[PDB]
Design a binder for this molecule. Structure first.
Ligand SMILES: Nc1ncnc2c1ncn2[C@@H]1O[C@H](COP(=O)(O)OP(=O)(O)OP(=O)(O)O)[C@@H](O)[C@H]1O
Ligand SMILES: Nc1ncnc2c1ncn2[C@@H]1O[C@H](COP(=O)(O)OP(=O)(O)OP(=O)(O)O)[C@@H](O)[C@H]1O
Ligand SMILES: [Ca+2]
Ligand SMILES: [Ca+2]
Ligand SMILES: [Cl-]
Ligand SMILES: [Cl-]
Ligand SMILES: [Cl-]
Ligand SMILES: [Cl-]
Lengths: 364, 25, 364, 25
């Protein structure tokens, strides 16, 4: 009777039961298959561990579903193996990326109703769920995950599509970048486990410098910023300025040969695409969500950068929940548990009479 | 008017009110 | 499974099943009891026919319920004897007069749920139902019944209470007036059947003169306006100018010693109490409802009178449906049959948890 | 927005559309 909540990230799938504090299952959004076959398939952690012999595929690219066969395998796995429930017995809330095409929204709807035979269904924009998680209906969300970074201005519960900004730079790019600078220091990371070590170094030692320039030299004249990382093999290594240099890419994409404005400028740009009367509320409700916004110092650095771009008189406020790795999921969990949401679900009956194009009509 | 708001506004009001979620075990 | 629709008029109760073209039962809103007892009671037609030995009571005065014990007897009669259905098996839609006190709305709710054990309930303003009958959500309704005449401006489905005007002059007053002028012509009407004859003369021979003054003299210099009325006893009588003089009271209450503006001025006054931006739409959607607006010539006379009060540039339009005797009822029948209304009913469950004060909250 | 209106606006739209009522017999 509990609704299921599934947040399909480019890198990680977060799944669980509506009403729960956190996702019961969090695993890689990967489908693995032996190199030329076309077990015939592996999903998540298992596909990851069997990397050496499989061809891994990510059905979600920059938040958009690009491989429907593989997406269905992930969904099937999520219900049956992770949550261990039959989908036909539960309302299902799925999430989608901002600016998701209408064809993609209908295909998702069709699969859920026709393939998994769900009794009730709903699709929510990820950034909006993060906003709801923070207990707001108006604000601007910065959602930085593994595949994509979006800036989503939301007014009275509805995102403003004309102002949505997408930055195709996220956690995956940061891991690869740390892997490059670490590699040039004389270390070797090329295997799965090694790449996982770099990702672990990133999530544990990395931080956003309040002042990059001043921080850099502080590592030049001292060993004050150097931390030692004990490898799984016992061997210990020293990571220095790569600590703050890797996440800096968010503010200066140029560091990865990327010709794009940083997260601070994109947030301003987005706010500026909104109606004047709403801007003040947006500046005062800048919500951070996603694994990639977990860097210590990011909120303090965004507050400074936005303050510098906004009018002097403007009250800028950054909201960075400690649970933001799962803010999208939590938002869905809250939404699908509300007494008030129970009339919002698309029913099987409704789908049967109007078809998948109902998803757009049903919207709210 | 003593009228309760739109179903969507009731949803927004409840999102702003916030709900306690069950601990994970 | 059909909802019941009951329009409780001061003079006539109109009852039937939602979806039907017209009320299946239309009978006097009277409760009769033998003079000093305090069958112990008679309702409707029977109470009327046993007039000589009973004390008749009207639990509805000028559209407002004033005797709850007697109202319950009418309701009980309506369900069990007229409609011949058990109320606990059907959603019930009841109507109420404009400006009905909140205590009266809650008492009605309490009786329906606690006494008749209805499964679902709704209370609608009579004038709004008449507007819906005409297929509009915006307009100004003139509802003239037996006990009261109201002018109700409605915008986007909601009446504007600050602009509602009540004129305590209606059909009962017109019958009594015709009974007086006919009596002074040398005829005698004092018994029930005689009074019923006058009411029949009123509903069959009376009309609204386009120009009272010019009409009067046309009856002075000719017998062109005189109609003969064949009494039940075979005896035939001649009714002359009383034909147009009796309904004229609507435009000039002074004729009955009443110091009040006529229906035309009250309509203008009401429109004037509304927001400017809405006035144009009101003038263009003047809807007539109730038995008392059935007089031939009334719409043509209202068009003329309103035209004279409104700005020269104003498009004035009077809507006088031929079925207006039952417009309130029909409006309820339509409303309660709409697929869209099915979520609007107050449930027994809802009443049980929140009590009768829910009626105000549930409003729409 | 391809969104259907408020339940109350759906009700208003249906009131304006009008419905055929069954003849009385
Ligand atoms: N504490 C942390 N610090 C830095 N990065 C982190 C941290 N935790 C997770 N990440 C990075 O967050 C990314 C996953 O976050 P998230 O689950 O929000 O993205 P996703 O939804 O799978 O992908 P996307 O939102 O782009 O579609 C991974 O790159 C992960 O390494
Ligand atoms: N054809 C007609 N011409 C003139 N008067 C009529 C006609 N038909 C009915 N009436 C008068 O209409 C009155 C009943 O109309 P209606 O049923 O709309 O009033 P009601 O709802 O019982 O009383 P109220 O609306 O004041 O509370 C009676 O006075 C009746 O004689
Ligand atoms: Ca995400
Ligand atoms: Ca009436
Ligand atoms: Cl530290
Ligand atoms: Cl709840
Ligand atoms: Cl005639
Ligand atoms: Cl319908």
């Amino acid at each position: 009777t509990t609704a299921l909540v599934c947040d399909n990230g480019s890198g990680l799938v977060k799944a669980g039961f509506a009403g729960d504090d956190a996702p019961r299952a969090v695993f890689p959004s990967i489908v693995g298959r032996p190199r030329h076959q076309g077990k015939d398939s592996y999903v998540g952690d298992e596909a990851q561990s069997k990397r050496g012999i499989l061809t891994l595929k990510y059905p979600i690219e920059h938040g958009i579903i690009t491989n429907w066969d593989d997406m269905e395998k992930i969904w099937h796995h999520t219900f049956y193996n992770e949550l261990r429930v039959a989908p036909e017995e539960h309302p299902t809330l799925l999430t989608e990326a901002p600016l998701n095409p209408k064809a993609n929204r209908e295909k998702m709807t069709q699969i859920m109703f026709e393939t998994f035979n769900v009794p009730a269904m709903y699709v929510a924009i990820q950034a909006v769920l993060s906003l709801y998680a923070s207990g707001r209906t108006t604000g601007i969300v910065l959602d930085s995950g593994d595949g994509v970074t979006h800036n989503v201005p939301i007014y009275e519960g509805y995102a403003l599509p004309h102002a949505i900004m997408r930055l195709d730079l996220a956690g995956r790019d940061l891991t690869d970048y740390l892997m490059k600078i670490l590699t040039e220091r004389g270390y070797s990371f090329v295997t799965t486990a090694e790449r996982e070590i770099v990702r672990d170094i990133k999530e544990k030692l990395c931080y956003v410098a309040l002042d990059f320039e001043n921080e850099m030299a502080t590592a030049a004249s001292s060993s004050s910023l150097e931390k030692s990382y004990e490898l799984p093999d016992g061997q210990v290594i020293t990571i220095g300025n790569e600590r703050f240099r890797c996440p800096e890419t968010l503010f200066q994409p140029s560091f990865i040969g990327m010709e794009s404005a940083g997260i601070h400028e994109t947030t301003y740009n987005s706010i500026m695409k909104c109606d004047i009367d709403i801007r003040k509320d947006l500046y005062a409700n800048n919500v951070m969500s996603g694994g990639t916004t977990m860097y210590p110092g990011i909120a303090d650095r965004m507050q400074k950068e936005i303050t510098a771009l906004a009018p002097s008189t403007m009250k800028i406020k950054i909201i960075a929940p400690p649970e933001r790795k799962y803010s999208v999921w939590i938002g869905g969990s809250i939404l699908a548990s509300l007494s008030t949401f129970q009339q919002m679900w698309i029913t099987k009956q409704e789908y049967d009479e109007a078809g998948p194009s109902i998803v757009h009509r049903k919207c709210f | 008017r003593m009228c309760e708001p739109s179903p969507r506004e009731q949803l927004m009001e409840s999102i702003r009110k916030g709900k306690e979620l069950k601990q994970i075990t």
